[PDB]
Design a protein around this ligand. Sequence first.
Ligand SMILES: CC(=O)C1=C(O)CCCC1=O
Ligand SMILES: O=C(O)CCC(=O)C(=O)O
Ligand SMILES: [Co+2]
Length: 347
Amino acid sequence: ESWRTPAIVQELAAAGVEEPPSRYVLGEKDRSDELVAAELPEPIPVVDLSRLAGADEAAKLRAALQNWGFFLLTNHGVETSLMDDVLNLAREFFNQPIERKRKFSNLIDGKNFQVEGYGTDRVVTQDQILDWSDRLFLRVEPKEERNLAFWPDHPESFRDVLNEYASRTKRIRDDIVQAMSKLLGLDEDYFFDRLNKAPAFARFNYYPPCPRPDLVFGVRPHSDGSLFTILLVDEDVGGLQIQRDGKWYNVQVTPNTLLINLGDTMEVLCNGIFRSPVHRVVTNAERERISLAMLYSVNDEKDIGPAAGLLDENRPARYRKVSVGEFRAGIFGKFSRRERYIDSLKI
Ligand SMILES: CC(=O)C1=C(O)CCCC1=O
Ligand SMILES: O=C(O)CCC(=O)C(=O)O
Ligand SMILES: [Co+2]
């Protein structure tokens, strides 16, 4: 009935909607870059966590973060029965009757929007184009601030399995941080002090099939605002596209592997040594696509700016140092917009 309450896309697709409603249809300029992406000209960066202390993988990790901003993590310790469980339980929640799922809506009373809960992202203006997907957005860290009213009670083991999966990726977070601290020549607890009691979120994305996969986005082109993201996809058939130098490339998170991409917070803190990739998801006609992304932010203690240990005489500050409040407002507000916030920091 109004633009502040957008529809659940899964139920639109399940209805057999003849064509995407105008609220999801892209403009002419945006539609010439999405229907076709190229393949990776260079093979996909892969890192083995079991030998990440070795000198060969560190060079592989450095090349990944400096040339692409993302990499596939293999041999990560997280058991496959756990990765399948958290994915299967996510699928069972999305396949519940809609009236059960609206109890966990992110529109409080069906009216006032908030981030946490089941739905889509914030609709700022009436003519804002919506993504062709829904997501279940939940806070996982710190545990004390967890709102269990939004954690699905059915299937009954969702809360325990998510809690168990989150602790496993948090340890992966700390192992990737220690390795990145060695590539930058910085001390470990520079990041850990900023990760202490820091926010972390779990985003369950559901990408329904679309009747016109050439007119919509599953998720808008964007870069994450976190420090970095740990992504898990359920039998990825395709859809994720990453941008480099204006050119879009297809990337496929193979099963049992975790994709880890850097966010905008890391690019500023490492003074642009490593990059934060702009990425998107495109739909297709037949099959739905489910992914879970673990987003790890920094706390609110230190300003968002290049690490002082990285600003020697040969390489000065390439970004401005900004307060944390001013940073999160820019990231949160520019997600629905075309321009990218972090570019305004470049000096
Ligand atoms: C933490 C933040 O970076 C993320 C969410 O807000 C929405 C999904 C994409 C990403 O931008
Ligand atoms: O669905 C994907 O493959 C990417 C996930 C993503 O971009 C996000 O949730 O921020
Ligand atoms: Co993303």
